[PDB]
Design a binder for this molecule. Structure first.
Ligand SMILES: Nc1ncnc2c1ncn2[C@@H]1O[C@H](CO)[C@@H](O)[C@H]1O
Ligand SMILES: Nc1ncnc2c1ncn2[C@@H]1O[C@H](CO)[C@@H](O)[C@H]1O
Ligand SMILES: Nc1ncnc2c1ncn2[C@@H]1O[C@H](CO)[C@@H](O)[C@H]1O
Lengths: 6, 609, 4, 609, 610, 6, 6
């Protein structure tokens, strides 16, 4: 999970 | 560089594979049957031709077949012939060769797209894909320039650049955008324009075919490439395609290792990219910090961005300087309220800013996460002391003991308001003084129309059971889109300013002038935010904050792709909808053709208040 | 009545 | 004819229903709120307006509200206004009126499409539809001619006919082809061309709106309509729409019963239609008599057709006259084999044919259905005697005692070969004499592109659990298509001739010149068959055998509708595919825009051998 | 009453059908093949027997076959024989006869369950049902008493689970066939009836026909067919289920015609309340529980509420008693009792309050709070036309309304079929801050009750409630408002949850139900009792049911897999009333005699929206 | 719908 | 069903 995502 | 050798003559297969590996190629594209060994399937006596039809399986090991050999279809196989006997023999032979490649377990298989009508080829391929279990990939060999446009002007008595893309588009549409059908692109001597190369770059290109005839010769004799060709090789190396070298050695003075060595040379001469590597075109789901409690690892991913928190610290620095003059420095205490304090990087930014501004602050760290409150309260016991007051409450339902000079929050998402920053800061502005400041001061979201066939296949592959079979097209996806094509410049959708002193429901109509023929696949959403006066954070692809990887773009898909041509304008409507319980987005394309309204009533995606 |  | 009165002024509502039911109308279109009672929803003091907002529920009973009243949206409600305050008040008031109509349980609600942009109206409607449980239909009130095109030429200093259809098309596309959204068409004085009316007649028209101003007066002073208006009324009366009469009494000497009386006069002034009644636009799965056994009630509707069996008897009569001269009338016995004899009717037809031809026949009645063998053998014991030999075997497995002079079969489906007549007759061809005849000796299938929003919605409504979510678009449907528009003339697809003394796999490309603008929704399949020389059975709409109802046309849907312009040819491709165990069809549209191959490998529909 | 004639001899089908319909029967149970015409399917020469196998389908019209004929399997067909040749021939002939019945389009087919092992019969039937398209129902002909327990004691060296035998046969059969909708019971009633709890288990089963031999009939003093009082009581119980009665056997009262056996059943049908008239058409028909808080009800939904006069009579009597109690007769003319009707509806509870204050001769200042904006239209037209200044109509939610004063009585009507599944506790919690400290809430308290039930038809209805685009077994995790009719109740109801007003609404209940029968548990039926004021109560509990009060059907909580229970085995179930800030739901789990999963965890299949 | 059910 | 359809 990276960039404000799960 | 992973590269391959395309041979159409393999006298012995083990010797040829050995020589190819000696030259340095990773795979070898070769015909599984003899290219000239035309076979009859209908008419006797040639239907009953005895003996083996091709080589033995046993000439290479199993792992050799599955990792080293890319099969080729025989050149005489024309399933779309105008002669019925030829096309039935070619259907049967294409089935036979595809089944032999499935039997050999080849990783890939090259089929040619060298004419406009390829419907029967598409049907035989689509029937092979749906018959049996096999996992080979199908690389459709299509040129950048059609061969009737590359021919010399030496005949006495005898759509230009967008021809072969429409060949590929028709083929992949007939085969229903299969995950197993990709592109092997032939790069010829004459190279098309920049926007033709952009649709092509948006495609599933798994390999690139470089004939040795397109290579120029230098003063030392080695093969080189033109500057436009070098630019195309760099754009393809961004995609990590495999280069296939075809043809014979035109630089006979040198070896065939030289064509490969030039590509290795270009490879060795090509923070955000290192972070985003391994996440390209990988669809996450956007975080919902208000409705879901995050994990330690999520917050840790947040806090590995020094640029964003340096920007917040600079904004608080400038605001503290503005709100307190130098003569009132030691007697004026500024109440800062960090709303959604997290594990505490915004609180540390505020403390470092008040040191740098050299002003006295009384800080509140509000956080509704009961598990991050543990971290905040251990911070408070050890480091912060009585300066910071940790509140374990929602900023909306928390009753403050005083008003705030500044409220600071990091509640922004990839689309700037999909994490309910307006609704959280709306309920958190009654404990702000009448001249109070909110950091971020305002934030805008920006949308651009995009084409990406791989992203469309990823969204299709997100079809989950026990729900609407097309509800994956009505969700935004946090995605580091890599293999895409942006059809038009981003335009602002929604703007929220805090404090709001005057409805968070919004409606926007955006008209995007497209100057190129394309196929719209979705909308990519970015944001900008003004924290304080000249301090901004942006994820827009032009004004992007450098090395700031907190936010990936957001993606709103559309259920069916919308074919667009030049001069048309894509008109799309975006709504920010809400009720007492939920917030969602709805979208619909209204020009050039209408789409359905996506996510009505938040039926596929809401953000929980 | 019904005549055109 | 069933008709209603559209009133915009209802002073007292029970009196109005009385005065409307006395003059013969069946329902009443009325505003649920006062049409001039503009409400405010955002600003004080008018937001807090006291008292009731509208009339009480209790003025009419529940049955009165659910059956007699069609609600109207207030004319000031403008959800697509360019002023944001008007837009938000209109969204809120539209929701209030729609919710009040859902609460009253009205059968229908009448909303206007009087401009090009109705996107926000579409969103508010499609969010109402997905909120709560309610069952109102939504009749979108759209004119045949835009109101700015039928204004007088009075101003001194100030898509022509395909305009309001594009309004409706955009609206129904944004609402995702809802089953609950239909058309209420306004017929003005200026009628459009004939091909505009055909698109209109292929739409979900539940009501037609006739102003009293389009009525012209006769010599006696009554309201009548022009001949073009009367023809439009007859075409609409074929669809069983309801007629809404709006406006004031323009013939004041008479009363308002006269317009309705003229409509009933045209109603009374208006065997296949009687049989097809109740089956219009009702999708069915095609019969598979080879893989399934038919009920006796399935055979009853076959034997309900006198024309087909009279034609078969005529063909056998002429063949028996040809094969036996008058001189050899008694000493020559012709062997007939009725293949798939059913419950009797072809055996009886052959017996009558040989009786009226005055020829001697030895007849075999082959039938694989054991339950139909029961009734065939009761026929044989009770009526036929030793002339007919009843065989309980498949014709492809049977070992005949002797060869045949004529083989007669009825194995034709609605698309002439979707019931495996080629494979069955090829299996049965080996016990035919070398100068033998097969009846039917010839059959061709025909395809024509069609548009129908209702048929598309029925195909979507065929979506089933435990199945691929778009398998329903990959199945032919035996449908008495009624509310459709046919885009081009039928054109022959596949031809089979028996006996075949030469592969039943077929590939056909059909190009349909579309002389109009449309939205392609599927393909309709018909067939012709030559039984004997000039005896034919046809369901093709120009060569249809009169009074014959044993075959409805086939519909091959497509997954997504394809918008077609004028001058654009539709190029479609059909495959008859087969293996050892099953036969299927695959189809794909290739021009103007491609579609996926539908039903690859027969994954959604096969015919079992 | 609809009745049929079972005949095993039909020499001519048209003549026999005419004679059967002449004497009053509505259908004819007959063999489609000859019962003695044993066919061979494997071994020559008898395999190749010529001629028609049975009589033609052209002897009756297609509608005659589709409506008037119930087909019978041939008696020699024994698909569970221990001889393999007989077993194979009987499988083949069973398939042939079933396929011919499907070809005829018969509405029903009778098959016998006359022995313990019927697994191969079940397999051939299950394969027939999953093959082709056909609509015929399959009536498994099962006796009430096993044939070996009805024989006379006349064997000198063989003297004569005893009562629960043939139900075990039927249970095993329909369990093998996966509880098909198309497989039902044709029950044979013999001379000697079993006990009353055996008759209750049978009555909870899909009985579509009852088979009455003429040999179980007694004889009058005038010489007519009659049945014993225990048989008549069985007939009266079966007439509630609307079964069809099949008369078998020969005319054992030969003096009068065979019409008399039918005439007695017509007599008993003509010799067997308002709730039963209201509930017709709704028996065993699952519908969703109403959620008035998060769904705005239609006007026709309110109309059936106002159609019950007993509930509003009781509310008016409770307000009457409370008004007398809170105002002495000396302070009658000067004390104004501020009433607040919360969720005022379209009017009827406000009208009850006004009528109560009139017959009590007391002065009230009434507030009618209602959140439904479309019922506020009705309320405000009521106020303009009738109520005037006495009633103040508020268009707000009781939980967020700011009252201008505190109430003496708050009156609500927020009770569901399980007394709290409409968030009456949560709504009346937010309506206590404008209640006076001596203020009264009506209803004062309410309790929910649960009882374990058994019903194959209810279980199949819940399975048929499976929807696409959701969890394939979520239908078992929702309560259903159901006029549950074809069911068997395994134990008495016990109280589950109690709420009292004015007052955590999360609850946990454990209920142990002693079982005295040998059944299969399919769910729990939930009822409620409410005390409005002192002795004024409304109850849907089937022992204390308020007479003629049809505002509430029982609730049903299913379980995903049926739990087979034996005698002396208590059923221990546990109910949770769970909630968060957003939603409220129920969870349940059977823990004895066999555990089941917790049904509806986190409200994943069913929540009540706050 | 009857008995408090839809 | 009519017209060769189930
Ligand atoms: N209403 C709220 N009150 C307090 N913290 C919040 C609120 N909404 C989100 N947050 C926190 O804000 C941070 C980023 O969204 C996370 O720590 C999250 O838990
Ligand atoms: N292969 C076959 N052999 C015999 N009868 C057949 C065959 N296929 C179809 N039929 C019969 O043909 C009739 C018309 O389709 C039906 O009675 C059907 O059962
Ligand atoms: N919180 C609430 N406030 C006001 N009325 C309510 C509330 N919840 C339910 N109701 C009303 O109570 C009635 C239930 O029968 C309905 O009229 C419903 O609208």
């Amino acid at each position: 999970g990276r960039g404000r995502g799960r | 560089v992973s590269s391959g050798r395309d041979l159409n003559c393999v006298p012995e297969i083990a010797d040829t594979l050995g020589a190819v590996a000696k030259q340095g190629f990773d795979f070898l594209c070769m015909p599984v049957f003899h290219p000239r060994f035309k076979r009859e399937f209908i008419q006797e006596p040639a239907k009953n031709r005895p003996g083996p039809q091709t080589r033995s399986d046993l000439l290479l090991s199993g792992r050799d077949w599955n990792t080293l050999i890319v099969g080729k279809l025989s050149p005489w196989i024309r399933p779309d012939s105008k002669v019925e006997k030829i096309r039935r023999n070619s259907e049967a032979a294409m089935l036979q060769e595809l089944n032999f490649g499935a039997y050999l377990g080849l990783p890939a298989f090259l089929l040619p797209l060298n004419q406009e009508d390829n419907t029967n080829l598409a049907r035989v391929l689509t029937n092979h894909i749906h018959t049996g279990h096999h996992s080979s990939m199908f690389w459709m060999r299509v040129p950048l320039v059609a061969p009737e446009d590359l021919r010399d002007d030496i005949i006495e008595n005898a759509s230009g650049e967008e021809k072969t893309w429409m060949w590929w588009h028709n083929f992949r549409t007939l085969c229903d955008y299969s995950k197993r059908i990709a592109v092997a692109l032939e790069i010829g001597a004459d190279l098309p324009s920049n926007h033709v190369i952009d649709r092509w770059l948006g495609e599933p290109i798994k390999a690139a075919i470089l004939p040795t005839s397109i290579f120029l010769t230098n003063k030392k004799g080695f093969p080189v490439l033109s500057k436009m060709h070098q630019r195309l090789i760099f754009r393809l190396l961004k995609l990590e395609v495999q280069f296939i070298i075809t043809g014979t050695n035109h630089h006979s003075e040198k070896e065939f290792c030289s064509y490969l060595q030039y590509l290795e040379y270009l490879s060795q001469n090509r923070a955000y990219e290192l972070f985003a590597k391994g996440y390209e075109d990988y669809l996450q789901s956007p975080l919902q910090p208000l409705m879901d409690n995050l994990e330690s690892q999520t917050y840790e991913v947040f806090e590995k961005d020094p640029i964003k928190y340096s920007q917040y610290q600079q904004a608080i620095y400038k605001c503290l300087l503005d709100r307190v003059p130098e003569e009132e420095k030691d007697t004026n205490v500024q109440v800062l309220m960090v709303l959604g304090a997290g594990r505490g990087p915004l609180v540390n930014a505020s403390l470092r800013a008040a040191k740098q501004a050299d002003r006295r602050i009384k800080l509140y760290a509000v956080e509704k996460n009961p598990n991050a409150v543990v971290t905040l309260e251990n911070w408070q016991f050890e480091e912060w002391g009585s300066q910071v007051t940790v509140v374990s409450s929602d900023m909306r339902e928390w009753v403050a003991p005083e008003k705030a000079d500044i409220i600071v929050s990091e509640l922004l998402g990839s689309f700037a308001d999909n994490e309910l920053s307006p609704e959280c800061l709306d309920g958190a502005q009654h404990f702000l003084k009448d001249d109070g400041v909110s950091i971020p001061g305002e934030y805008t979201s920006f949308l651009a129309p995009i084409s990406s066939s791989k992203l469309y296949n990823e969204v299709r592959a997100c079809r989950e059971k026990d729900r609407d079979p097309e509800a994956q097209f009505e969700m935004p996806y946090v995605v580091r889109l890599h293999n895409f094509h942006q059809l038009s410049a981003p335009q602002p959708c929604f703007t929220f300013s805090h404090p709001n002193r005057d409805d968070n429901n919004r409606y926007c109509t955006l008209e995007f002038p497209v100057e190129v023929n394309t196929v719209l696949h979705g909308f990519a959403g970015y944001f900008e935010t003004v924290l304080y006066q000249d301090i901004t954070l942006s994820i827009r692809p032009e004004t992007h904050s450098p090395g700031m990887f907190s936010w990936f773009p957001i993606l709103f898909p559309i259920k069916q792709p919308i074919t667009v041509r030049e001069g048309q304008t894509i008109c799309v409507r975006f709504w920010r909808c809400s009720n007492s319980k939920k917030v969602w987005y709805e979208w619909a394309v209204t020009a050039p053709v209408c789409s359905a309204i996506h996510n009505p009533t938040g039926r596929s995606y809401t953000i929980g208040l | 009545q019904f005549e055109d």
